Structure formats: structure tokens, C-alpha cells
Design a binder for these strands. Structure first.
Ligand SMILES: [Mg+2]
Ligand SMILES: [Mg+2]
Ligand SMILES: [Mg+2]
Ligand SMILES: [Mg+2]
Ligand SMILES: [Mg+2]
Ligand SMILES: [Mg+2]
Ligand SMILES: [Mg+2]
Ligand SMILES: [Mg+2]
Ligand SMILES: [Mg+2]
Ligand SMILES: [Mg+2]
Ligand SMILES: [Mg+2]
Ligand SMILES: [Mg+2]
Ligand SMILES: [Mg+2]
Ligand SMILES: [Mg+2]
Ligand SMILES: [Mg+2]
Ligand SMILES: [Mg+2]
Lengths: 115, 39
RNA sequence: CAUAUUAUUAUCUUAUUAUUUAUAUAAUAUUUUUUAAUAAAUAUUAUUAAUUUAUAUUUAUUUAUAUCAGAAAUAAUAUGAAUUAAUGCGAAGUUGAA
RNA sequence: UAUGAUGUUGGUUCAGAUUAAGCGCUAAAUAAGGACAUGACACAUGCGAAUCAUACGUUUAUUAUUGAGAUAAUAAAUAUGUGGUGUAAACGUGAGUAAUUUUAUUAGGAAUUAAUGAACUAUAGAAUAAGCUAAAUACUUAAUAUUAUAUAAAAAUAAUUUAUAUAAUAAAAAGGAUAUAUAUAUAUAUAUUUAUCUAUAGUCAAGCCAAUAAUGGUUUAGGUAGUAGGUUUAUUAAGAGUUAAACCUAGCCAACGAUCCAUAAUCGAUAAUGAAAGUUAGAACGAUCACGUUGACUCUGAAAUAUAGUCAAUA
């Protein structure tokens, strides 16, 4: 994270049940103040799955809603995503491995796009 | 005292303007609305 | 009659600051005229530190204007007041006959 | 609820919902949402802004070469020395403020806002010399790198824009960390890293003005002399009596309420209520402004009368 424009997560919800708002915001402004744009939402809690479903083969899913075309516009301009936003966008395929870090093998499931 | 001289200048200007307004009230040739001009 | 706070000013005082005047054997840099100490070579010749000198950058001193804030005067905004005006209520009644 | 009874006018009260709530009595567990509205009254105590050793310096220990030290390699220590970045935000508050710069709205404007980037993006380039610091990426001095003219062209024209050619733009910088390669510990030369400076554009941002609305008292009725307007000058990136100077004109506001006084931060896709128009609040969520004990000024900076600095006031 650096620069004036940053793509971050703003905390919404209630105590002990966070949800997050993927926003484009000024660095110098407050975390929960109204941002430049609201690119999406991110619900951190995985969807619970039945013990049976663990055996069947499905995994918990985390729900992210995002504007793919607009996030490309903001990344192009030089808005600097944060570490968590970097992780989210990199899984989405928006960001490639150039954004990986040393701190961060096999692929059970490759990324797939569907309607 | 520059304040005193400035105040005197302001006063002179103001009284000049009030005299101008008072004499401008009677500067207009006021005909008789009843009887028209004198002749 | 007494206390309090904002506001202003042809008044008094003024921190600091901003411009603005003038003065510096006043400084610092460079430019001259010069004086000492030091080096190299066969009388020196240049070098540093000081002497005078005239351009900048400031310091001290002053001239003027404005200026925080203080008084003094006025006004208001309030707060209290002996003295004092009116009226409201109620107790059972008292007096007139409007 | 009048009335001896009737009809009507007329007030008073009640039924409903709510709260930034308080109090009386009473009270089990859990989940969530809030919590000094009053004295912007005063404050004990502890915390809330640090970080960088890969900027410069210091200080050790071992090994090697040199002879008390000197120089390298490797380990460390050093944020009480010199430096870089950060505190214009966020947090809290609602004193001031009735608009002279505040709030809300507009598919609103120009002066037709700067050779401003503040901190990232994409591109090119450059990174020189001295001095002073003990040394430097600290400071100074110096080197090199849009606007105004003149010619035309047009039209979105009685100006702007375009292109050209000149003038000045002309304004900078900084190295550290590793490796290696040369040669003669000394320099030097490349590469990798992380910095530095300039330029174009993008993004994020700023400054200014307009129109409409924004509480009560006229038992506050006249107010205003920079006052209202014009012309110049200084200042600003930029208009304007905004501030300072000069000279002209006599205007401007006002019974559809000026000026003055009192009170108040303002608002919403927020909260309460109603059938609705509306009315109330502005706690909580969010937006804007103001302030950080009080007043004025100054430096830096693009942006500050800064929670900075100076001066004064209070304690
Ligand atoms: Mg009765
Ligand atoms: Mg709770
Ligand atoms: Mg309070
Ligand atoms: Mg070191
Ligand atoms: Mg230090
Ligand atoms: Mg602030
Ligand atoms: Mg530098
Ligand atoms: Mg005026
Ligand atoms: Mg108030
Ligand atoms: Mg109100
Ligand atoms: Mg307030
Ligand atoms: Mg609120
Ligand atoms: Mg509160
Ligand atoms: Mg302030
Ligand atoms: Mg306090
Ligand atoms: Mg203050």
C-alpha cells in the first residue's frame, strides 16, 4: 500500500460478524468514511457445509461480489491494492503472479469462468 | 494622527454626498400635476 | 444606585509583525589601494591573517502607517437591588342597589 | 366536560406512537445497537507517534596483513551526535457562526485558475563541479536539461484556437547495498537492487464566483460613508472596495422587513411522527464546516493566521 489512491477493505456489519466492502479510497482518509468508489463486497466467513458434503467433495465457498471491468480501470490508473485485496484479486485472475510476495504447490482446482 | 485625518476626509466626503442628494431632490423641475406648466 | 461581558473609537499606551524612511570608522562575503608572517628558487615573487576601499545579504539604531492586548469614554447585552406601579387567586364575610 | 333540557361556537383534557431520556418499584440468561445533551469548567496518574543501522557518523570482538595503532573480511552494539520520512490526517468537540468566506441543490459558471504534485501509474532522459559540516542522500554557490512577441491559417470569431519562428523557458538531482571485471589497499567499469532529479499525460486533488432556500423580535424604522458604482496601481495562480494607495460619480439596502438584538453548528437515501402535505431531532450511521485554553501575526508549504513558531492573555 502506497500512494494517494488505494483499493482497500472497509469494515461493515456488526460486532463479531464482519463483512467487508472493497472500495477505492484516499489513503489519508478514514477507513470507514465514504470512498471514491465501491467496487464490491467480500463476506469473509466461509459458507458452512454439511459433514456429508465434506465426503461428497465440495468445499466451503467465500462470497465476493466485484465489478471486474471497473477494477481493471482502477488498477490501470495506478490505484495500489492492499495485501488482502491483492490476495482476492490474484485469486480472481485479475492480477497475475507479478503481485506475489516471498512470504506467500499443486492445483486441485484450476480457476474457471462460467455463466 | 492618520486615523483623525482619514476620519475628517470621510466626514467631508459624506456631508458632500448628503448635500448633493438634498439638492438633487429639488434639482428636478417639478411641474404642477394639476395645472401643468406655469405658462 | 451596584456588578459583569462583548462592540466601537478624531483619545492614551503598545508586544510582535508587515511594509516604509533615514544612519552606521557595524558586521559577513566578494573588488580595489595596501601592511605584517610564511614559503620556493636566484632583488624577490607570490601566498594566508590583518589595513583602506564599493556591490550584495543581514544586524543595531531610528522616521512614518497598521497591529494582539490594556486602559478612558459611550452604547448595548445580561445579572441583583432599597423605593415603587398594576393586576391574579382564594377564606368566610362586610357594604352599596349599578 | 356547556345547559333545567336542546342546537351551535369555544377552549381544557383524554385515547395513539416515540425518546439521546430521568426517577419510583422490580428484575433471569443470551445476541445485537448506544452511552456527560449540562461547565468549549478545571485536571492527579499511565498511555495515544514513531521509524530507518542499506544516509552520515560513532563503539566493540575475532581473523589476516602490517607496528600504541592503521587497513580490510566477518560478526555485532549505537536513534543521548548530524540526517530522511510521518503528526494539513485521524480522534474529539459544537464554542464561534443567521452568512463577509457557513450548509443544501444545479446535467451552473470563469478570471476563460499557476511553466504547483502533494504520491502512485505509464513512458523517456539525466544524475556535473566546488565549498561548509567531523562526514553525507544535511546545507549553501555554480554548471547542463510554459508564457510573451511576430507571421500566417481558420471559425465554435467581432475573440479564441491552430501551426510556425524567435525570446527568455532554464527550473534540477544523491547516493547506499551487493556481486563481479580490470588493472595499479587504490581507484576505475559493468550488471542486480533500492533510492534521487527533470518532462508529457492519467488518477487523486485544490482555490474563486453565481442562482434558490436556511429561527424570533420592527415594542429594532430608517440603515450605510469603503458606504454603492466607475477608473488605474500594488498583491494573488486567479475575479472582486478583499486588502493598501490615488482620482471620479452619488449612489446601494429597506414595511414581500433593512439595520440592530437574541438564539443556533448545517444537512441526508439518518431518527420520530402523520393518511399525506408537513412537523421535530441533528444522540447514533453518513456528508460539510468550525475549533483543539483565548487573540493577533510569521515560516514552511500547492494548500495553514496550523493542536507548528513568536508575542501577549488566563491557570
Ligand atoms: Mg358542570
Ligand atoms: Mg454491548
Ligand atoms: Mg459536551
Ligand atoms: Mg552504520
Ligand atoms: Mg538523532
Ligand atoms: Mg486538522
Ligand atoms: Mg537533496
Ligand atoms: Mg467592504
Ligand atoms: Mg452555539
Ligand atoms: Mg435548528
Ligand atoms: Mg456550534
Ligand atoms: Mg451525528
Ligand atoms: Mg456522544
Ligand atoms: Mg485552529
Ligand atoms: Mg481543555
Ligand atoms: Mg485559537
Amino acid at each position: 500500500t502506497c500512494g494517494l489512491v488505494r483499493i482497500r477493505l472497509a469494515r461493515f456489519g456488526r460486532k463479531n460478524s464482519p463483512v467487508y466492502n472493497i472500495v477505492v479510497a484516499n489513503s489519508r482518509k478514514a477507513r470507514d468514511a465514504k470512498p471514491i468508489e465501491v467496487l464490491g463486497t467480500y463476506v469473509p466467513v466461509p459458507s458452512p457445509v454439511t459433514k456429508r458434503e465434506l465426503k461428497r467433495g465440495v468445499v466451503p465457498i467465500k462470497d465476493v461480489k466485484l465489478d471486474f471491468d471497473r477494477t481493471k480501470y482502477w488498477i490501470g490508473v495506478g490505484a495500489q491494492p492492499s495485501e488482502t485485496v491483492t490476495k482476492l484479486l490474484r485469486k480472481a485472475g485479475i492480477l497475475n503472479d507479478a503481485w506475489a510476495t516471498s512470504k506467500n504447490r499443486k492445483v486441485v482446482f484450476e480457476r474457471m469462468e462460467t455463466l | 494622527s492618520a486615523k483623525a485625518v482619514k476620519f475628517l476626509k470621510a466626514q467631508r466626503r459624506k456631508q458632500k454626498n448628503e448635500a448633493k442628494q438634498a439638492t438633487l431632490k429639488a434639482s428636478t423641475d417639478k411641474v404642477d400635476p394639476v395645472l401643468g406648466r406655469a405658462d
